[PDB]
Paper text:
BK polyomavirus (BKV) is an opportunistic pathogen that causes severe diseases in the immunosuppressed (Bennett et al., 2012). As expected, the BKV capsid has a T = 7d quasi-symmetry, and is built from 72 pentons of the major capsid protein VP1. Each of the six distinct conformations of VP1 present within the asymmetric unit of the capsid shares a common core fold, which is the β sandwich, “jelly roll” fold, characteristic of many viral capsid proteins. Crystal structures revealed that polyomavirus capsids consist of 360 copies of the major capsid protein VP1, which form 72 “pentons,” each consisting of a ring of five β barrel-containing VP1 monomers (Nilsson et al., 2005). Together, these form a T = 7d lattice, with a C-terminal arm from each VP1 making interactions with neighboring pentons to stabilize the capsid shell.
We present the 3.4-Å cryoelectron microscopy structure of native, infectious BKV in complex with the receptor fragment of GT1b ganglioside. Owing to the low concentration of our virus samples and low affinity of polyomavirus:receptor interactions (∼1–5 mM) (Neu et al., 2008, Stehle and Harrison, 1996), to study the BKV:GT1b structure we implemented an on-grid soaking protocol, where a 20 mM solution of the oligosaccharide portion of GT1b was applied to the carbon-immobilized virions for 30 s prior to blotting and plunge freezing. GT1b is a branched oligosaccharide, described previously as having “left” and “right” arms (Neu et al., 2013a). The disialic acid motif located on the right arm, of GT1b is well resolved in the 3.4 Å map. The binding mode is similar to that seen previously in a structure of GD3, an oligosaccharide that lacks a left arm, bound to a BKV VP1 penton. The left arm of GT1b is poorly resolved in our structure, indicating that it is not ordered at high resolution. To examine the possible location of the GT1b left arm, we emphasized lower-resolution features in the map by applying a 5 Å low-pass filter to the 3.4 Å map. This revealed bridges of density between Asp59 and Lys83 of VP1 and the GT1b density, consistent with previous mutagenesis data of these residues (D59Y and K83A), which resulted in significantly reduced BKV spread in cell culture (Neu et al., 2013a). MD simulations show that the left arm of GT1b is dynamic, explaining the lack of high-resolution density in our EM map, and its previous intractability to crystallographic studies. Low-resolution EM density and MD suggest a likely mechanism of binding for the left arm of GT1b, in which multiple, weak interactions occur with the VP1 surface.
Author numbering:
A (entry chain 2): 14 to 359
B (entry chain 3): 16 to 358
C (entry chain 6): 311 to 359
D (entry chain 1): 14 to 52
Amino acid sequence: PKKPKEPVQVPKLLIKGGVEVLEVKTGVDAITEVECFLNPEMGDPDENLRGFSLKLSAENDFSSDSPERKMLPCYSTARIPLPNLNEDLTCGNLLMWEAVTVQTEVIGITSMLNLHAGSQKVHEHGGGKPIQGSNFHFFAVGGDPLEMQGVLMNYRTKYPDGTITPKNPTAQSQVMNTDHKAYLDKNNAYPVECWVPDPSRNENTRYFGTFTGGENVPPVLHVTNTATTVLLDEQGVGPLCKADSLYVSAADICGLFTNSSGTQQWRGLARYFKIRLRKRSVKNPYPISFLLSDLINRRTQRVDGQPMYGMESQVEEVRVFDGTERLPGDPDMIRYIDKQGQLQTK
Amino acid sequence: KPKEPVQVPKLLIKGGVEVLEVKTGVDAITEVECFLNPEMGDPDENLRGFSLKLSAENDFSSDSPERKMLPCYSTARIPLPNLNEDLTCGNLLMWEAVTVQTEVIGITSMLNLHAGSQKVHEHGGGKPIQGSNFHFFAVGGDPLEMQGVLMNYRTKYPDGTITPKNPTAQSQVMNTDHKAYLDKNNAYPVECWVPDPSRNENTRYFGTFTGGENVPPVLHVTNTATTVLLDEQGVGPLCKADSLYVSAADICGLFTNSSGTQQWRGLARYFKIRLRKRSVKNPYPISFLLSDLINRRTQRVDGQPMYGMESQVEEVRVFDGTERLPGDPDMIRYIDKQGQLQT
Amino acid sequence: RRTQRVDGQPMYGMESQVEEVRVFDGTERLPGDPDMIRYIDKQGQLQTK
Amino acid sequence: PKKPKEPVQVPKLLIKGGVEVLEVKTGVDAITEVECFLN
Ligand SMILES: [Ca+2]
Ligand SMILES: [Ca+2]
């Protein structure tokens, strides 16, 4: 009979599955879609109370402030190992993965409608006080770890041992201080109150975040599977995965949970991620003399000689002779190249 | 001299749900209009759309809510016909939800301040409905696959509600072992189930949450809004089964009684879905009908596990083509999976 | 051998947090099954006992 | 099989550093990016 119209050519799914699926030898124009999540690291004050913090210390002195480790929300971070694009390119070309498109979402937003759960009674015969207060929703997707900046308040706070902090803070550390650069290289260590992502150094990641701080503000959360964030820059490239690794970071403080006794503690939710990848032809920016210099420096013996480089060097004169010239009248002449051209002092 | 009238797509038949079973042309557009009543708990027969009054300070150890208090998801299924007549092997011809146009019915009912609301101050009127609210809808060709995230995993739920099974402290956050579909009305409470951000490949769910102790419900009401259900490939939710699935959950705020006992308020939600006929590759050919026939006539074997977490298949080498002989039989694929990086 | 070693959340192994990986290669006529399920009976359901 | 394309032409980075790059003489069609802060 009458045949239907030909269906539109969609991309062909090869294999769906878990993380073991990435190993498939595909072609050049393959695209993968990694779907994952991150759990919030809110402090977890005992084994029964995951996702909350410990209760807040109310009024510490500004000089003798010493918080504890269980009441500090920290950043979440993770590395997704990607397989190598083992190819046979010419003239110093490669292939790397490119984070083209992220599609994120907070998992568990309607759980905040639980009002019969030890929350503070809202009025005389009311229900429970819902979760509200200062909230912070952050996510960062890139091919390198999240390079961040240590900016805090009250540099005289005595942090505990588990949390990694800005090293030797001064009064300058209560505003921008260039000495407090660090990476995000550890889950559940870097607290949110000390570490903002570095606006000067995240050349390979794409970090997005918003903050709203009040005594009682509404946590407004949208949930949708059609929103889509493009991770491309002005040149049309995304986060390139230098080492075959995809770095995913997040921080989702949703508000303060007020207990029945009137004692507040934080609340965090998970964060879905969906990164769309592809294979980018790049060039090798580095010469072959970086491969061979690393091979030699781990097979040749380390010699503790006399210093032949530095401020106490023992090499006195080096002269480079290339090409022929007419005989100059000054043998004790001095010759070099200043900025671009050959110069000749005396 | 005036011109001819413009070409408008010709209406054929208007009516109820029985218009669906009419066999039409292949280039036919169907606009189904329906609604969903809120399953807010309904504490007795004379009070619909409310919930029961809220319990206040049940601690985490001993927390047992009641059945009529928890607002649950609304869902329904719209029976669509089957469209092929002969085999026509290769391509098939399914429905496709192109455009939803939704709306909450009854938003000006919240102007009723002479009802059982609490007196707002010394001689004022009633206190309006405000507080935590959540407006949600989903349109797809599958039931709304959803993820179980709650707080207070030691909550003892009633028997009427279906909840995430065997919760741990990991269930107070994202736990992968709480997958379920939305195939039952008034049993999946909203405080336990968010729609699954990974597994809904055939629905289009839309939702806004707005917490807070007293925030205004802001509800627009318009018949010129239009939501496009197409993905980045240009296809809407295909109806695999001969059915269209419609889900919603409308919480509009807390109704404060004269005694002070707060209780929820929900409203209905309009749906206007455009359906066209799209030609797809047949997911159920003769070979599927063959293999499903021999499936049902084969003896069930309860043997040792060969799939899942406790699986006993160790290694599968799938290999098809030919290859020049490698210099590495166990060729490494990840340069560094576990991490032999610096510092 | 020069990248910073992060110690993050388990994105590999038994306790992995990657939920799903799709891999696409070429073009295909539009399937009528958007969750392209392969096993006609993976669990063993709808077999005769 | 199928070979991947050539890489995309991006603007060539020349020199990266602190304040001392704001002394270097550059070309006519040179595009600098000054990154700074104010306390
Ligand atoms: Ca920079
Ligand atoms: Ca998915």
